[PDB]
Subunit: 114 residues, 4 copies
């Protein structure tokens, strides 16, 4: 199944933050309406924040997280969770290797802000 | 029901990261085995990463998040989600006022690391 | 925080299923737009299905689950999860006693159907 | 990533319940410690509970859900959620066609029981 794709309310500001847990340098691209809106990269085996930004979901509401290492797309896992019918988390993990820890790049999207 | 309390695997490294979305300065306390292990603070209405830290879950694995605004405890909402039976997120939202957006301090705990 | 309240897409069919794990008979009310849409009653300490019903979210999209024993409201916990940006679960637990297992009546709402 | 596989605590009672939403007959097999422990079959486009059962996770705690339509495995999506650090749901969706509603067989595992 498709992973790392989320439908947000239109024209809504959301937060996106990425962490790294890998010997490989991670590249995280955040797409809004199929176009790269933010790119984060870095390397850490200690959950270092490799990027954070506030973006706008625009008129499509379509937000996609892609993770790549040495040009090769990582395998993604994702889900959305809503707390008290108000607070949204869109969560992404990724695997770049063979140990299947799925934490090599971790991405957290949250809304609403403000 | 109790919120912001999570049982992690014992003696395990986890990341804890806090975001602020309020006019009030937020104070986030992270307790490990009922003792304060980290404290983050900041003020933003634009999802500032007011703190992030790697901690060890200790002997019991009990991790608790508490949020306050100048000594006044905020109301908490929380859940844990596990992706591909491997990647864990413990999620916390909090409300310091009356608009019930529950984003005033958002806390994300993730494991495993490395 | 308010629990057991969910916003569904308008005019959408959804399934609601209730399980019992308590010595007390559980009374489960499902409200749609603040009015009774379904009521289940049953007792089991072995996860028996005490009700299942296909409902329509109608014009409001507001769905609320209430659980009580002899008219006294149980404490609720709830969250919504979305898989592959398509499949929705609205989940509810309830506690009618002191042991805090939160399973006394468990309610699962799922959509889309068909 | 692997989907539909969950590690439960060893020797724990759990409920498993399968719903059908497809023109095709669904077969749901539930494996514990790699051995079929329950099997449900049925066709519905109205969220019929094609089976529910109570099982024990045994010494391994390994539970796997498989879904097939006349001998072809459906594509699975899954996640586990925990509310108030106590109530667990292991959730499975599956797709047997092209529309990607991922509801063709839906399986919900819940614990604790009693
Ligand atoms: C050395 O192992 C680390 O780096 C590899 C990539 O080389 C990851 O897949 C693995 O999970 C570890 O984080
Ligand atoms: C002014 O409104 C903002 O600040 C208050 C606290 O004063 C929050 O509760 C609210 O959600 C907004 O973030
Ligand atoms: C006897 O214990 C059972 O019934 C009570 C209600 O009396 C529940 O609260 C409890 O979790 C058990 O299911
Ligand atoms: C006719 O459409 C229905 O049946 C097909 C399988 O034939 C499913 O994939 C689809 O989601 C619908 O439930
Ligand atoms: Ca890895
Ligand atoms: Ca890793
Ligand atoms: Ca608020
Ligand atoms: Ca706020
Ligand atoms: Ca109870
Ligand atoms: Ca009970
Ligand atoms: Ca389908
Ligand atoms: Ca279907």
């Amino acid at each position: 199944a498709t992973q790392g794709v989320f439908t947000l309310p239109a024209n809504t500001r959301f937060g996106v933050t990425a962490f790294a847990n890998s010997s490989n340098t991670q590249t995280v691209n955040v797409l809004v309406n199929n176009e790269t809106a933010a790119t984060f990269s870095g390397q850490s085996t200690n959950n270092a924040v490799i990027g954070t930004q506030v973006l706008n979901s625009g008129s499509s509401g379509k937000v996609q997280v892609q993770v790549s290492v040495n040009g090769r797309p990582s395998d993604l896992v994702s889900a959305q969770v809503i707390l008290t019918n108000e607070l949204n988390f869109a969560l992404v993990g990724s695997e770049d290797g063979t140990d299947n820890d799925y934490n090599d790049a971790v991405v957290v999207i949250n809304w609403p802000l403000g």
